[PDB]
RNA sequence: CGCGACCUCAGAUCAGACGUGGCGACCCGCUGAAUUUAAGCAUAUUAGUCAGCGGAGGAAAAGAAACUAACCAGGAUUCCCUCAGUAACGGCGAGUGAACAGGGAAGAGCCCAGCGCCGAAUCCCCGCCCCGCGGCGGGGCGCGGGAAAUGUGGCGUACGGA
RNA sequence: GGCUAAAUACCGGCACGAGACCGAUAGUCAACAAGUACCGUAAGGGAAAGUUGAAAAGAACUUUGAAGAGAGAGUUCAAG
RNA sequence: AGCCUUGAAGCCUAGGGCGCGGGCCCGGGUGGAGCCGCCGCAGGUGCAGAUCUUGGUGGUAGUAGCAAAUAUUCAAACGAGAACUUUGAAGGCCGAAGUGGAGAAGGGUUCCAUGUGAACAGCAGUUGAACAUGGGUCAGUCGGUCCUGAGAGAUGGGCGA
RNA sequence: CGACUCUUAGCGGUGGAUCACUCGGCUCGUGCGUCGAUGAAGAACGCAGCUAGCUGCGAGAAUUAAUGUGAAUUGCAGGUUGAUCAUCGACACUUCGAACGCACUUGCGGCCCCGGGUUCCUCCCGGGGCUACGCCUGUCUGAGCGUCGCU
């Protein structure tokens, strides 16, 4: 009775949707995230999880600020100058 | 399992050597980079020599090598005192100066 | 669960809008490589994770 | 009406009162499974709902 | 050969820069040579084609000596559409047959201020090159 | 949809079954 | 001293590494004081530190911390090397005196194993094959 | 008419607010027409109305923030939005004069013994 | 070929039982690649046998006198009449095979 | 008991700044094994290695001898060839294993405390004026507020200095 | 007690160039809506999938069947 | 001064052959865009087996099977098509700890209307929890929100590289 | 000649093997070598006239302004004093996230200033600016049977 009859009792949930990494890995009992470590101030990353590195790096997401940092870098970070109008 | 006859040997490949392999395909690009850096220095200092300041006639230590004569680090303070050149004048006019040397001979 | 929360209801609200298929004009373009919607999630087949 | 989800009932009441020039009896809000807030704005009986609907164009 | 170490001599990279070019490079690539009379008159070898230009077809099934106005220039498929160059679909409607601008000669230009500026700049560069060759 | 996995091993002919046991 | 952070005994391995009590930590307690002060204050930068008193159960160190952002340090050119971003957290890399006493760097025959940048640079420079182009 | 960006800068701020409110009313009318079922002319006009509202708000924001930085230009302390937003490691450097601040003994050595210009013979 | 090609996948062998060919296969999953076989040269995907290294002995050095001997032989064969035509050069109308032209 | 200083220690949504976190291929500081070999295995070997932790930079570290040598003495650090699979270590078994010197790329030196001379001759902040202000600086005017004699600045540091 | 460029390292990032390499069961897992679909509570595991034609010119119209389907006719050098 | 849209590679072949053999050259069909002979050079270079890896397809085989919980029959309508859709009548079952009416966890548009019979409901469907368009959840008084339980978890402090 | 079975050939179906194409990988080399409390990496949610995925953007939401380019995007409709594109230097960037008013239920607060409410008279509603910990310099308020000077 450890199989099919025991699978029917599974209705309450322990993990839930986290709010920093987005993956459903936020434990409700220990109040910690199993993916990124949300009560910890630092992002939980490891070198043994080399495949799970590239799932979450800088090149994966949006880069809404890093691409304009690169765009300002490729012309040497000018600020305040305006081009010559018509 | 060694065979009939040959030299005894100790190959040092028991470590993980394949992670640290210094490939030398940078070599002609580094020769071009040194060439461009030396030409850039020669164009930077226009009347000055491209090699640098002069270097002393130096006898070698360590009796295997004492017959040969090198170009050393710099002139000595007693050498500049006998010549009549101040040590802060010599570095500005292009003369290598080091204080650690002596004059026994 | 009738007792929903706002975060879970918004997460289901986005998936309900993603559940809709493709239109008929999208396979009339030049550089099209889309025949049908391959991300059609059925409510009995894929249980949305969780 | 269909309302942004960040609103209040007082915000919907003052918004209808400002952008329709009409007094509001009460506001009943719900959030649809599409995502936006459906708002049943019950008006005062001095004005007509059919008349203000023909005034704003909906029919 | 090429002596600039930044100019691409790679097939896949050149085809990438061709088929993923923005529209101002699309207009520059889609250019057509002028005729002998206009070439002698303006000393201009080629120009980018416009929607309001006249065209004789040089090569293809619809080649000949017919001067037709361009319908419109469709830069997504790298094509132009000519007025009398068209064929009948089975249902009955006429569809303009696609002609690439490399097989296209111009008989008359549509002249605006920017068009005259481009022609004067090309004539000036041609005279400077002829002076350097002299 | 779900690709039916490799048929779960059913520990049968081993030692706990008294249906098939050779010579001991 | 430092004992091994393991349970009761149970150090799973060869009988070399079962030692737990008589292990000694590689850096000095003065450098431990420096890195604790630098971890408590990331804005302040460690210059050095010194001993004032010791008990059987404690030692006591005065750690000198410097503002790299105050104007009296910034406009003084003798100390503006502290204001450079290269010297951020000297206490962790071991750039102060108590850290450099633990690195074991120096000149001569007594410091062969740290020739080059450090002990790690010495080991990496020694354990590489230089497989040339023409060999 | 085509609401351009050049003529919006010269006008008064209350006229910009009146034009913005008229564009908001006209956008609400086009949304009502879209939901009731309207013309494709209105369905394409609503995008032009959105871009015109974007242009009017952009011109209002320019006339606000250039005037605010003209106001806070003369003072020593200025708000964080008006301070030049560049990278953090470049903002936390030394100043331009403080990179040129040398000590008295270094200035004395640079005065007494400069790097001379010289050449040698063959 | 890169060293990470093939070894990024984790695959423990099932071993005995389960009428399988004793190959390290992908650990579970409800996806086309589940119990398929990752490691080994013969399996689909994975790695090939003998990954070609960056530290191969590409460059061969030649003695300087052998290089100069090759230059001397390549120049001396450019004077004989039959060795040039056996290369394939149409030289029927050339007035002299050691073709020496002026400094203009 | 009251008043006024000094010394320690608090409270501030006080005025002006800073640090937290990410990537981490290279670099630094710790902690750090077992697979493997020794045809077993326990010292050795894998190995200061995989993994774990913390820290910045465009390079990091190191760096101008408490040096190498014993010669007719060389003279900051870093990297390559050679020294060299050598001296040496090791159930002296398996195996591990430098440094000097020479040939080159590069080559740039210095600053404090102390000792002492100078009326604190020194530094920070706030008020006004001029210039410039999108790397908030230069000068003048304040019986303005502080830091500092439990020591700020100039000469001066092993190559002598006053 | 402390500072200091240079020659040195770079499988991360941006812009690039080349190949006695691979040619869709090969090469990065991924040439395509790829860390995507899907599985596992979770840490994590993780695919398959290119080729109409030069131009959609994607078969008008008639006819049997409700339609899926055909038979004529038509486009193209080629519907083999 | 090789072949080639006056037809390259690949593939098929009841043809002519050659070489002991590895294999190779022509004849005929399909194909539409590159290919080979000789001297040297280099390799990720030759498959019948690995309980070989992937993909596909046979005998078994139109076979086992579509057998747990009493049961369906007649007429009419929609429709091209009816045993399974709908309605009327008859006979039954769940027999108030129900095969009824409602909740919690969980599912997340499955709830409702209209149309479809391309794909699923291991037979069939005019039917559906399927497909495609559209709708649907209205609170001071119903719950969360307030409180605390077993516990979790900051500040001071201690420890810790 | 029957049915069924075996071999070969023409043709037609399952199948996508070979060949040729490649906007893609792998390797090597060069230059630059820059994130963040002035809010990073990442995540969530929204944004198209018809828009699911990808791509791009942030309530100004497949983009705003400026410069250059010089008659388009296009799948379908819709309308030269600058359409579309690239650069992007100005403006702007929803909610979590070091995340920062305390917790993560999107709940509950506190202070100040404005508009309805008022006729400062307190609620209520709406809007704006602050309220995370540690630490550096200065200011203010302080405590000490700590060290003192005066009555
Ligand atoms: Mg639980
Ligand atoms: Mg970390
Ligand atoms: Mg043998
Ligand atoms: Mg032998
Ligand atoms: Mg289920
Ligand atoms: Mg050129
Ligand atoms: Mg051991
Ligand atoms: Mg010591
Ligand atoms: Mg001094
Ligand atoms: Mg592979
Ligand atoms: Mg404050
Ligand atoms: Mg052993
Ligand atoms: Mg063994
Ligand atoms: Mg054993
Ligand atoms: Mg060791
Ligand atoms: Mg590690
Ligand atoms: Mg950090
Ligand atoms: Mg940096
Ligand atoms: Mg350094
Ligand atoms: Mg040395
Ligand atoms: Mg030797
Ligand atoms: Mg022995
Ligand atoms: Mg060792
Ligand atoms: Mg040496
Ligand atoms: Mg040199
Ligand atoms: Mg002094
Ligand atoms: Mg010295
Ligand atoms: Mg010293
Ligand atoms: Mg020293
Ligand atoms: Mg240093
Ligand atoms: Mg090249
Ligand atoms: Mg494929
Ligand atoms: Mg394939
Ligand atoms: Mg593949
Ligand atoms: Mg293929
Ligand atoms: Mg195909
Ligand atoms: Mg194919
Ligand atoms: Mg054909
Ligand atoms: Mg072709
Ligand atoms: Mg090959
Ligand atoms: Mg086979
Ligand atoms: Mg049967
Ligand atoms: Mg019930
Ligand atoms: Mg019910
Ligand atoms: Mg069925
Ligand atoms: Mg239903
Ligand atoms: Mg009521
Ligand atoms: Mg705790
Ligand atoms: Mg055959
Ligand atoms: Mg395939
Ligand atoms: Mg959408
Ligand atoms: Mg614009
Ligand atoms: Mg423009
Ligand atoms: Mg709660
Ligand atoms: Zn998380």
UniProtKB/TrEMBL annotation, chain C:
Q: Which residues form the signal peptide?
A: none
- InterPro entries the record matches: Ribosomal_eL39, Ribosomal_eL39_CS, Ribosomal_eL39_dom_sf
**Which UniProt keywords are present, listed alphabetically?**
Ribonucleoprotein, Ribosomal protein
Going by the entry's taxonomy, the superkingdom of the source organism is recorded as Eukaryota
Q: Do you know which Pfam families this protein is assigned to? A: Ribosomal_L39
Which PROSITE patterns does the entry link to?
RIBOSOMAL_L39E
Annotated GO MF terms: structural constituent of ribosome
The keyword Ribosomal protein is annotated on this UniProt entry = yes
Q: Which Gene3D superfamilies match?
A: Ribosomal protein L39e
GO CC annotation: what is one?
Answer: cytosolic large ribosomal subunit
Show the coiled coil region(s): none
GO biological process assignments? translation
The record describes its quaternary structure and partners as:
Component of the large ribosomal subunit. Interacts with IMPACT.
Q: Which family does it belong to?
A: Belongs to the eukaryotic ribosomal protein eL39 family.
Q: What does this protein do?
A: RNA-binding component of the large ribosomal subunit. The ribosome is a large ribonucleoprotein complex responsible for the synthesis of proteins in the cell.
**Name listed for the protein in its UniProt record:** Large ribosomal subunit protein eL39
Species this protein is from: Oryctolagus cuniculus (Rabbit)
Its gene is LOC100343258
